[PDB]
Amino acid sequence: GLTLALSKGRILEETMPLLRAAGVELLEDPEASAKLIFPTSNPNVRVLILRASDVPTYVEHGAADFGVAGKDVLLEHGANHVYELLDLKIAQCKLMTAGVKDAPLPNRRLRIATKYVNVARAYFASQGQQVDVIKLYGSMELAPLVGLGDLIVDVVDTGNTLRANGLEARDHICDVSSRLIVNQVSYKRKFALLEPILDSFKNSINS
Amino acid sequence: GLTLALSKGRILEETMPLLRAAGVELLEDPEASAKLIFPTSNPNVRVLILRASDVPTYVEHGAADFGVAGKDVLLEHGANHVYELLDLKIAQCKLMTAGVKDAPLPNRRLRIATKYVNVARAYFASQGQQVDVIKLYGSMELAPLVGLGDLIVDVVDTGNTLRANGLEARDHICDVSSRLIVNQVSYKRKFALLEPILDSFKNSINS
Ligand SMILES: Nc1ncnc2c1ncn2[C@@H]1O[C@H](COP(=O)(O)OP(=O)(O)OP(=O)(O)O)[C@@H](O)[C@H]1O
Ligand SMILES: Nc1ncnc2c1ncn2[C@@H]1O[C@H](COP(=O)(O)OP(=O)(O)OP(=O)(O)O)[C@@H](O)[C@H]1O
Ligand SMILES: O=P(O)(O)OC[C@H]1O[C@H](OP(=O)(O)OP(=O)(O)O)[C@H](O)[C@@H]1O
Ligand SMILES: O=P(O)(O)OC[C@H]1O[C@H](OP(=O)(O)OP(=O)(O)O)[C@H](O)[C@@H]1O
Ligand SMILES: [Mg+2]
Ligand SMILES: [Mg+2]
């Protein structure tokens, strides 16, 4: 059958309506289980629950035939060995730069504190800046408060996180939504299983 | 004053008794707050709550003067630009290799699924193996079930996680406890503040 890689929180929550419309429901709540492999109402489809970071890794190697990944994670991971088939328009946010509100930029090479080191470098390169990048894994909004780095790059949605910590978004880098990715082989070998799920999602997202 | 980097869960929980003995208590529970900078009973000491991965990063750059980091995270991060001053003997576990119980090793170059790619490489190198490493961020115990990689490297404590997923530990790599690390400059510049806290911890750990 098909293995679908998802992640907890917004992607699991916001994907389920798309799955339900396509004839696929989980038989329990993965948020409440230690389990990581879940059957569905469709015995041709099961689900993996992974860290957001690992969804492309699983789909690339074909541990999963397909997954739902944030565009931020694909941009950072590189998506050269998976096919991006659909923009699902869920878990919508922005990649942004940010700093202490009204904090002047220092006139030296910039230090960007981010999980998204490759996106930070590419974005600053497009703005004419070779920056240094301090790699972190969470709570990017702490970095500028303690003077770790001049700016951060992170996902902004409401901007509540930035505002609460006295930060403000400086640049918008790009819009981020979750994307349906397929294993390059799975697409060739199990398309008959993928296709009616792809067509259902495509129709669902139009609404 | 001094900034102490800690992380949530076991390290925060198991460090607090050491801090209390040294005259330092948090004025609230960081597990229940969105906040990330916490004053203490000691107005010369405040606390950062970070991802475990980021504690050395903060201490290295001196965003934090000192922190409590797992030895697994120091080994993987490299600890060449911090001083390891004490083995606190908390959050004790092992770095181990593991696979499907009784699964034979394939007679090709090995694929290790781990967060600890540098530890995996070093350990397999000491065993005469140049392995490939599939980088992941969590739920290492899923990898072998779906045939992502031949083995995993991960922290084992009770082994409950391995057993529940039908995995077994193959090799013990090394013992892991949390370590007190200092910024190389903070050690030189604020030793008068560090010393009585260091002496208290050292005494505490003897018991
Ligand atoms: N506030 C938000 N609103 C909407 N979408 C978001 C928001 N924050 C993140 N996302 C999107 O959701 C994806 C996954 O979010 P999630 O919180 O699971 O990631 P994470 O912080 O890396 O998780 P982990 O704790 O496993 O590292 C992101 O990669 C991004 O595309
Ligand atoms: N089961 C365990 N028993 C004891 N110590 C543990 C156990 N698991 C991990 N540790 C130790 O605790 C440290 C931090 O644990 P924690 O669970 O916060 O890490 P993590 O999974 O990277 O967290 P995050 O979700 O932020 O990525 C580890 O680096 C290790 O030294
Ligand atoms: O702009 P806002 O609406 O404040 O949202 C932005 C935040 O949302 C996400 O946090 P999440 O809830 O996933 O916490 P975590 O990812 O740090 O665990 C993300 O990590 C951002 O920090
Ligand atoms: O050998 P055991 O006693 O089963 O412990 C080992 C597990 O403990 C930790 O999990 P944690 O509770 O930190 O979950 P997480 O790190 O995967 O979030 C670690 O990630 C190991 O998987
Ligand atoms: Mg998150
Ligand atoms: Mg953990």
Residue numbers in the entry:
A (entry chain A), B (entry chain A): 23 to 229
Report text from the authors:
ATP phosphoribosyltransferase catalyses the first step of histidine biosynthesis and is controlled via a complex allosteric mechanism where the regulatory protein HisZ enhances catalysis by the catalytic protein HisGS while mediating allosteric inhibition by histidine.
The activities of R32A- and R56A-PaHisGS decreased 25- and 42-fold, respectively, in comparison with the WT-PaHisGS. The active site interactions are very similar between the two structures, except the electron density for Mg2+ in R56A-PaATPPRT was not well defined, so the metal was not modelled in, and the hydrogen bond between E163 and the PRPP 3ʹ-OH is absent in R56A-PaHisGS. Therefore, any structural or conformational differences that may lead to allosteric rescue of R56A-PaHisGS catalysis are not captured in the static view of the crystal structure.
